Short mmCIF file of C-alpha atoms and ligand atoms in Angstrom, two decimals:
data_model
loop_
_atom_site.label_atom_id
_atom_site.label_comp_id
_atom_site.label_asym_id
_atom_site.label_seq_id
_atom_site.Cartn_x
_atom_site.Cartn_y
_atom_site.Cartn_z
CA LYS C 1 -16.19 -2.60 -3.45
CA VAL C 2 -15.56 1.18 -3.87
CA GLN C 3 -14.30 3.76 -1.33
CA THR C 4 -16.88 6.22 0.09
CA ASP C 5 -16.60 10.03 0.58
CA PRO C 6 -15.75 10.56 3.51
CA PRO C 7 -13.62 7.31 3.39
CA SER C 8 -15.10 4.54 5.61
CA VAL C 9 -14.38 1.27 3.69
CA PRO C 10 -11.38 -0.74 5.11
CA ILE C 11 -8.45 -1.01 2.63
CA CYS C 12 -8.59 -4.87 3.00
CA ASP C 13 -12.24 -4.72 1.69
CA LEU C 14 -11.10 -2.71 -1.39
CA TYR C 15 -8.51 -5.48 -2.17
CA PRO C 16 -10.17 -8.87 -1.22
CA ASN C 17 -7.30 -11.11 -2.51
CA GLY C 18 -5.04 -9.42 0.08
CA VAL C 19 -2.76 -7.98 -2.65
CA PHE C 20 -2.30 -4.24 -2.06
CA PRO C 21 -0.95 -1.47 -4.38
CA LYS C 22 2.84 -1.16 -4.59
CA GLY C 23 4.49 2.17 -3.80
CA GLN C 24 7.02 3.85 -6.11
CA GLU C 25 9.66 1.29 -7.20
CA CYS C 26 13.16 2.68 -7.82
CA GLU C 27 16.34 1.20 -9.15
CA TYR C 28 19.09 1.50 -6.49
CA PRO C 29 21.59 4.41 -6.94
CA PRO C 30 24.94 3.58 -8.67
CA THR C 31 28.08 3.23 -6.50
CA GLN C 32 30.95 5.83 -6.31
CA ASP C 33 32.77 3.89 -9.13
CA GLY C 34 29.76 4.53 -11.45
CA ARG C 35 28.63 0.88 -11.78
CA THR C 36 24.82 0.42 -11.63
CA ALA C 37 22.88 -1.67 -9.07
CA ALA C 38 20.31 -2.35 -11.88
CA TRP C 39 21.44 -6.06 -11.80
CA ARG C 40 19.19 -6.42 -8.67
CA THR C 41 15.99 -5.90 -10.82
CA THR C 42 16.78 -8.96 -13.00
CA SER C 43 18.69 -11.25 -10.53
CA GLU C 44 16.96 -14.64 -10.02
CA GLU C 45 18.46 -14.92 -6.49
CA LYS C 46 17.15 -11.39 -5.63
CA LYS C 47 13.68 -12.10 -7.15
CA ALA C 48 13.35 -15.27 -4.97
CA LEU C 49 14.58 -13.51 -1.79
CA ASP C 50 12.09 -10.64 -2.58
CA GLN C 51 9.10 -13.00 -3.10
CA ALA C 52 9.94 -14.90 0.15
CA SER C 53 9.13 -11.59 1.99
CA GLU C 54 6.06 -10.74 -0.21
CA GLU C 55 3.62 -11.07 2.77
CA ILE C 56 5.70 -8.48 4.70
CA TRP C 57 5.81 -5.93 1.81
CA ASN C 58 2.13 -6.57 1.38
CA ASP C 59 1.35 -5.63 5.05
CA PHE C 60 3.35 -2.31 4.61
CA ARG C 61 1.40 -1.70 1.31
CA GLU C 62 -1.99 -2.12 3.06
CA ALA C 63 -0.85 0.31 5.84
CA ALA C 64 0.53 2.78 3.13
CA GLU C 65 -2.79 2.72 1.21
CA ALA C 66 -4.68 3.54 4.46
CA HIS C 67 -2.11 6.40 5.00
CA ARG C 68 -2.64 7.83 1.45
CA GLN C 69 -6.45 7.74 1.74
CA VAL C 70 -6.48 9.19 5.29
CA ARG C 71 -4.15 12.09 4.40
CA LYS C 72 -6.04 12.96 1.14
CA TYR C 73 -9.24 13.17 3.25
CA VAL C 74 -7.43 15.32 5.90
CA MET C 75 -6.22 17.75 3.16
CA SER C 76 -9.84 18.28 1.93
CA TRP C 77 -11.09 19.60 5.34
CA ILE C 78 -8.12 20.74 7.53
CA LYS C 79 -8.75 24.45 8.09
CA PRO C 80 -7.88 27.33 10.45
CA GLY C 81 -10.64 27.62 13.11
CA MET C 82 -10.62 23.88 13.89
CA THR C 83 -9.23 22.90 17.29
CA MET C 84 -6.12 20.63 17.30
CA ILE C 85 -8.30 18.03 19.15
CA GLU C 86 -11.03 18.11 16.41
CA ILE C 87 -8.34 17.65 13.70
CA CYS C 88 -6.66 14.69 15.49
CA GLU C 89 -9.96 12.99 16.34
CA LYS C 90 -11.38 13.36 12.79
CA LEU C 91 -8.07 12.04 11.30
CA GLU C 92 -7.77 9.11 13.77
CA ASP C 93 -11.48 8.07 13.38
CA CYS C 94 -10.84 7.65 9.63
CA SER C 95 -7.46 5.91 10.19
CA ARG C 96 -9.02 3.30 12.55
CA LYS C 97 -11.77 2.58 9.94
CA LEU C 98 -9.42 2.26 6.91
CA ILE C 99 -6.79 0.20 8.72
CA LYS C 100 -9.65 -1.98 10.16
CA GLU C 101 -8.28 -1.63 13.71
CA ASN C 102 -7.92 -5.05 15.39
CA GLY C 103 -6.02 -4.85 18.69
CA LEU C 104 -2.29 -5.21 18.05
CA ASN C 105 -2.78 -6.90 14.60
CA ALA C 106 -3.87 -3.70 12.73
CA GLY C 107 -4.13 -0.13 13.97
CA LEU C 108 -2.49 3.22 14.67
CA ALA C 109 1.29 2.99 14.97
CA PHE C 110 1.61 6.25 16.92
CA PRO C 111 -0.32 9.43 17.86
CA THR C 112 -1.21 12.14 15.36
CA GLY C 113 1.51 14.73 15.44
CA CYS C 114 0.17 18.23 14.57
CA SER C 115 3.17 20.28 15.81
CA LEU C 116 2.96 23.98 15.14
CA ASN C 117 5.33 26.70 14.04
CA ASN C 118 8.67 26.48 16.00
CA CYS C 119 7.58 23.04 17.26
CA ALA C 120 8.75 20.40 14.82
CA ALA C 121 7.54 17.10 16.26
CA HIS C 122 5.73 15.21 19.04
CA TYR C 123 2.98 17.63 19.86
CA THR C 124 -0.53 16.15 19.92
CA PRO C 125 -3.18 17.80 22.19
CA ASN C 126 -3.94 16.28 25.63
CA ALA C 127 -7.53 16.50 27.06
CA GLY C 128 -8.67 20.10 27.64
CA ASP C 129 -6.24 21.60 25.10
CA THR C 130 -8.09 24.63 23.58
CA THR C 131 -5.45 25.30 20.84
CA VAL C 132 -7.09 26.38 17.55
CA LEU C 133 -5.31 26.10 14.14
CA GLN C 134 -4.53 29.62 12.81
CA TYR C 135 -4.23 31.01 9.25
CA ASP C 136 -0.46 31.71 9.84
CA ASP C 137 0.30 28.33 11.45
CA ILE C 138 2.79 25.88 9.82
CA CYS C 139 1.43 22.47 10.92
CA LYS C 140 3.30 19.13 10.67
CA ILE C 141 0.83 16.25 10.22
CA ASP C 142 2.68 13.11 11.18
CA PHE C 143 0.65 9.95 11.66
CA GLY C 144 1.25 6.22 11.51
CA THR C 145 -0.61 3.06 10.50
CA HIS C 146 0.43 -0.58 10.80
CA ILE C 147 -0.58 -4.11 9.75
CA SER C 148 0.99 -6.85 11.93
CA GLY C 149 3.50 -4.32 13.25
CA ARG C 150 4.71 -3.33 9.75
CA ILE C 151 4.73 0.43 10.32
CA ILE C 152 4.13 3.29 7.89
CA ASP C 153 5.86 6.40 9.32
CA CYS C 154 4.83 9.19 6.92
CA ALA C 155 4.37 12.98 7.31
CA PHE C 156 3.68 16.26 5.48
CA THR C 157 3.33 19.96 6.29
CA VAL C 158 0.04 21.89 6.20
CA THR C 159 -0.05 25.68 5.56
CA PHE C 160 -2.69 28.26 4.52
CA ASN C 161 -0.44 31.33 4.03
CA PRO C 162 1.70 31.18 0.81
CA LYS C 163 4.64 32.86 2.71
CA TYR C 164 5.88 29.36 3.69
CA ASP C 165 5.78 27.92 0.12
CA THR C 166 9.54 28.10 -0.50
CA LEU C 167 10.36 26.63 2.97
CA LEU C 168 7.98 23.64 2.18
CA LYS C 169 9.66 23.29 -1.26
CA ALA C 170 13.16 23.17 0.35
CA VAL C 171 12.16 20.42 2.83
CA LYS C 172 10.24 18.35 0.26
CA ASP C 173 13.30 18.55 -2.06
CA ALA C 174 15.65 17.56 0.84
CA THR C 175 13.44 14.54 1.77
CA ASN C 176 13.19 13.48 -1.90
CA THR C 177 17.01 13.80 -2.16
CA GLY C 178 17.44 11.56 0.93
CA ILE C 179 15.07 8.97 -0.60
CA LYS C 180 17.02 9.03 -3.97
CA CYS C 181 20.42 8.61 -2.28
CA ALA C 182 19.21 5.76 0.01
CA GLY C 183 20.21 2.25 -1.00
CA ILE C 184 21.64 -1.14 -0.03
CA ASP C 185 25.31 -0.71 1.14
CA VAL C 186 24.92 3.13 1.10
CA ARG C 187 26.54 4.77 4.15
CA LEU C 188 23.95 6.49 6.40
CA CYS C 189 26.16 9.64 6.65
CA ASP C 190 26.17 9.96 2.81
CA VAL C 191 22.33 10.14 2.83
CA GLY C 192 22.60 12.81 5.56
CA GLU C 193 25.21 14.81 3.61
CA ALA C 194 22.98 14.75 0.47
CA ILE C 195 19.95 15.99 2.51
CA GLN C 196 21.98 18.87 4.09
CA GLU C 197 23.44 20.08 0.74
CA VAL C 198 19.99 20.34 -0.87
CA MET C 199 18.29 21.86 2.27
CA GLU C 200 20.94 24.66 2.60
CA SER C 201 20.78 25.49 -1.15
CA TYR C 202 17.47 27.29 -0.42
CA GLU C 203 17.09 30.85 0.88
CA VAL C 204 13.56 31.93 1.88
CA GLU C 205 11.87 35.24 2.70
CA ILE C 206 9.09 35.21 5.38
CA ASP C 207 7.46 38.51 6.57
CA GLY C 208 10.36 40.69 5.33
CA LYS C 209 13.10 38.51 6.88
CA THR C 210 15.47 36.26 4.94
CA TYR C 211 16.88 32.91 5.99
CA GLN C 212 19.11 30.17 4.62
CA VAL C 213 17.04 26.98 5.41
CA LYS C 214 18.69 24.87 8.12
CA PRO C 215 18.16 21.11 8.47
CA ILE C 216 17.27 20.23 12.09
CA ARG C 217 20.41 18.30 13.02
CA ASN C 218 18.93 16.34 15.95
CA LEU C 219 15.78 15.05 14.06
CA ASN C 220 16.95 12.23 11.85
CA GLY C 221 15.70 9.49 9.56
CA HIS C 222 15.77 6.04 11.13
CA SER C 223 15.38 2.30 10.59
CA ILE C 224 11.97 0.76 11.40
CA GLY C 225 11.53 -2.76 12.87
CA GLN C 226 8.46 -4.89 13.62
CA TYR C 227 6.35 -2.99 16.26
CA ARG C 228 9.45 -0.75 16.52
CA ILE C 229 9.13 2.83 15.16
CA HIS C 230 12.92 3.45 15.63
CA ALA C 231 15.00 0.26 15.21
CA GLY C 232 18.34 1.89 16.25
CA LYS C 233 19.94 2.99 12.93
CA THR C 234 19.91 6.76 12.22
CA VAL C 235 20.36 8.83 9.03
CA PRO C 236 22.60 11.62 10.53
CA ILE C 237 22.46 15.26 9.29
CA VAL C 238 25.72 16.34 10.98
CA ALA C 239 30.38 4.20 9.30
CA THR C 240 26.97 2.39 9.43
CA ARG C 241 25.46 1.21 6.13
CA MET C 242 21.88 0.54 5.02
CA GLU C 243 21.39 -3.23 4.50
CA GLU C 244 19.20 -5.44 2.29
CA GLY C 245 15.68 -6.03 3.63
CA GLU C 246 15.86 -3.01 6.00
CA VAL C 247 13.02 -0.42 6.23
CA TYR C 248 13.66 3.28 6.79
CA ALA C 249 11.71 6.41 7.61
CA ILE C 250 13.44 9.07 5.46
CA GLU C 251 12.44 12.32 7.14
CA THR C 252 13.86 15.81 7.00
CA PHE C 253 13.06 19.00 8.85
CA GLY C 254 13.85 22.53 7.67
CA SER C 255 14.02 25.45 10.10
CA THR C 256 14.34 29.27 10.12
CA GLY C 257 15.58 29.00 13.75
CA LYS C 258 18.72 27.48 15.26
CA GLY C 259 18.30 24.10 13.48
CA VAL C 260 18.31 22.31 16.88
CA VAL C 261 15.21 21.25 18.88
CA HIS C 262 14.74 21.14 22.67
CA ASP C 263 12.03 19.55 24.89
CA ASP C 264 9.17 22.01 25.38
CA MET C 265 5.52 22.10 26.61
CA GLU C 266 3.69 19.27 28.30
CA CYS C 267 4.27 15.73 27.15
CA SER C 268 1.51 13.88 25.22
CA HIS C 269 3.51 11.03 23.54
CA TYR C 270 4.75 7.91 25.39
CA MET C 271 6.08 4.50 24.40
CA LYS C 272 7.26 1.40 26.21
CA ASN C 273 11.02 0.88 26.10
CA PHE C 274 11.28 -1.88 23.44
CA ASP C 275 14.14 -3.63 25.36
CA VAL C 276 12.41 -3.79 28.80
CA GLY C 277 11.23 -7.28 29.75
CA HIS C 278 8.43 -8.21 32.18
CA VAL C 279 8.52 -6.04 35.36
CA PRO C 280 6.32 -7.17 38.33
CA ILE C 281 4.35 -4.23 39.78
CA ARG C 282 2.29 -4.33 43.00
CA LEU C 283 1.23 -0.60 43.14
CA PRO C 284 -2.44 -1.08 42.00
CA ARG C 285 -2.96 1.97 39.70
CA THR C 286 0.52 1.58 38.16
CA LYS C 287 0.02 -2.18 37.63
CA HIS C 288 -3.42 -1.53 36.04
CA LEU C 289 -2.03 1.17 33.74
CA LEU C 290 0.90 -1.00 32.58
CA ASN C 291 -1.60 -3.85 31.80
CA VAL C 292 -3.73 -1.37 29.78
CA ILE C 293 -0.53 -0.31 27.89
CA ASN C 294 0.58 -3.97 27.28
CA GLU C 295 -2.88 -4.99 26.01
CA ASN C 296 -3.62 -1.96 23.81
CA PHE C 297 -0.21 -0.70 22.60
CA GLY C 298 2.56 -3.19 23.46
CA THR C 299 5.76 -1.53 22.10
CA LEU C 300 3.81 0.90 19.82
CA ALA C 301 3.52 4.53 20.90
CA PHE C 302 0.41 6.09 22.50
CA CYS C 303 -0.79 9.41 23.83
CA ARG C 304 -2.84 10.53 26.85
CA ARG C 305 -6.01 10.98 24.66
CA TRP C 306 -5.72 7.27 23.80
CA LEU C 307 -5.77 6.36 27.51
CA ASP C 308 -8.80 8.72 28.08
CA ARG C 309 -10.77 7.06 25.25
CA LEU C 310 -10.20 3.64 26.99
CA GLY C 311 -12.06 5.03 30.03
CA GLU C 312 -8.89 5.53 32.09
CA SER C 313 -8.72 8.40 34.62
CA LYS C 314 -6.34 9.45 37.53
CA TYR C 315 -3.47 7.80 35.67
CA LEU C 316 -0.94 10.67 35.60
CA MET C 317 0.89 9.49 38.75
CA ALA C 318 0.76 5.88 37.49
CA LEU C 319 2.22 7.06 34.11
CA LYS C 320 4.96 9.07 35.86
CA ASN C 321 5.81 5.88 37.87
CA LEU C 322 6.17 3.86 34.64
CA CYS C 323 8.42 6.62 33.16
CA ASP C 324 10.52 6.84 36.41
CA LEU C 325 10.97 3.02 36.39
CA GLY C 326 12.17 3.20 32.74
CA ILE C 327 9.36 0.87 31.56
CA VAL C 328 7.78 3.74 29.55
CA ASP C 329 9.69 6.64 27.96
CA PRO C 330 8.07 10.09 27.56
CA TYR C 331 8.53 11.75 24.10
CA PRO C 332 7.82 15.48 24.72
CA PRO C 333 7.30 18.05 21.93
CA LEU C 334 10.58 19.08 20.27
CA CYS C 335 10.77 22.75 19.37
CA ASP C 336 13.26 25.18 17.83
CA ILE C 337 13.55 28.81 19.16
CA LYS C 338 10.46 31.01 19.71
CA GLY C 339 9.43 32.75 16.50
CA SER C 340 11.06 30.15 14.20
CA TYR C 341 9.26 28.07 11.52
CA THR C 342 9.76 24.36 10.96
CA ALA C 343 8.55 22.09 8.13
CA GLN C 344 8.70 18.30 7.60
CA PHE C 345 8.25 15.65 4.91
CA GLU C 346 8.65 11.95 5.57
CA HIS C 347 8.24 8.64 3.75
CA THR C 348 8.70 4.98 4.61
CA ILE C 349 10.98 3.09 2.19
CA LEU C 350 11.51 -0.68 1.78
CA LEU C 351 15.03 -1.77 0.78
CA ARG C 352 13.73 -4.85 -1.09
CA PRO C 353 16.34 -7.27 -2.61
CA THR C 354 15.33 -6.27 -6.20
CA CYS C 355 14.52 -2.51 -5.81
CA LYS C 356 13.93 0.44 -3.42
CA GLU C 357 10.20 0.95 -2.83
CA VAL C 358 8.88 4.32 -1.50
CA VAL C 359 5.91 2.40 -0.17
CA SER C 360 4.12 5.53 1.23
CA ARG C 361 4.54 7.67 -1.95
CA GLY C 362 1.30 9.25 -3.21
CA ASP C 363 0.27 11.69 -5.97
CA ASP C 364 0.44 14.37 -3.24
CA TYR C 365 4.08 13.91 -2.04
C1 HZE I 401 12.58 11.70 19.93
C2 HZE I 401 12.84 11.26 18.51
C3 HZE I 401 12.53 12.33 17.49
O1 HZE I 401 11.97 10.15 18.13
C4 HZE I 401 12.18 8.88 18.60
C5 HZE I 401 13.35 8.47 19.25
C6 HZE I 401 13.47 7.16 19.74
N1 HZE I 401 14.65 6.73 20.37
C7 HZE I 401 15.89 6.82 19.56
C8 HZE I 401 17.11 6.66 20.44
N2 HZE I 401 17.04 5.38 21.15
C9 HZE I 401 15.83 5.31 22.00
C10 HZE I 401 14.59 5.48 21.14
C11 HZE I 401 12.42 6.26 19.50
C12 HZE I 401 11.28 6.66 18.84
C13 HZE I 401 11.16 7.96 18.32
C14 HZE I 401 9.87 8.34 17.66
C15 HZE I 401 9.61 8.62 16.31
C16 HZE I 401 10.45 8.79 15.09
N3 HZE I 401 11.76 8.91 15.29
O2 HZE I 401 9.92 8.88 13.98
N4 HZE I 401 8.25 8.79 16.17
C17 HZE I 401 7.62 8.58 17.39
C18 HZE I 401 6.27 8.64 17.72
C19 HZE I 401 5.90 8.46 19.01
F1 HZE I 401 4.61 8.52 19.37
C20 HZE I 401 6.86 8.18 20.00
F2 HZE I 401 6.45 7.97 21.28
C21 HZE I 401 8.18 8.11 19.70
C22 HZE I 401 8.59 8.30 18.34
MN1 MN I 402 6.96 10.45 11.60
MN1 MN I 403 10.06 9.03 11.87
#
């Protein structure tokens, strides 16, 4: 079976034997002492431990192939004049088809981020949002796919005006640096220090103003767990080591602003607190909403548009109740100062026993 244009064929139909394309495979970086970690590639113990988790890497690979094909399609049509809603719906319709959405077993890991300009992350339009993409907008497309809760967290920046080219270059180089420095037994702060050094080596000129690119210090790379976008370990920009078999989202953000984000605009993104157990609720609308969340999302993130498409209405008070009880956490848009520009690149990497796999790498980024 061959993929259509626009893509509509599920990835699992393109690979019937259930064996999906590998991402970029990298030898681990050498230690401080200069001795290589190349021994991992040829170790019989490492090869066996790697093959024991083959089904897991395979689920990430299926989700990464859906991500590559969705984003290549997005790049062919994303244009100024389109509303943010139109962009998110057209992207998500394709994502659901390629991932072969099946309740909590395959689907969308989190809402389509399409944060603009000074806003770096966690903006997706809510119903009635009339925002239109502009020629001068710097748009961060951040979307997620999953197979059995094996999440692909992967993002890029969309622009139409060449004035942002050097800012995009700086961030892409910083993300790629973070990915290269990542490895088993590597200290998380060393990855962060490598990212910062590369990011700040760039100076950019935008509309007659110059800036030294700043990494956003409170938007960090993180570990990923099953059905858990952020598994608790962070790659800090400003003791903890990466371990064998861990999975990371290596993401970096460059800014012309303060290099710090704050909560701004209305909230669209929400997610159940992973650690909260069963909570009995009698309030009817609140109980119904939590059941809708448990059935459709579990511990994966969602947005208000995703409740609307399920035929839910008059749920805002119910959603506020779940947030106030600590069952659900709101994730509002995170923005730098007015007039600033932010850019992002992100990949998911597998710290396999034998090698480091940039599972979401494409020919694009
Ligand atoms: C605010 C921050 C940028 O992102 C997070 C912080 C957390 N927390 C850390 C501290 N401990 C509590 C959880 C968890 C999850 C995220 C998060 C990420 C991510 N980091 O890539 N992507 C998402 C998408 C969503 F739709 C969502 F709803 C949440 C996220
Ligand atoms: Mn992301
Ligand atoms: Mn992330």
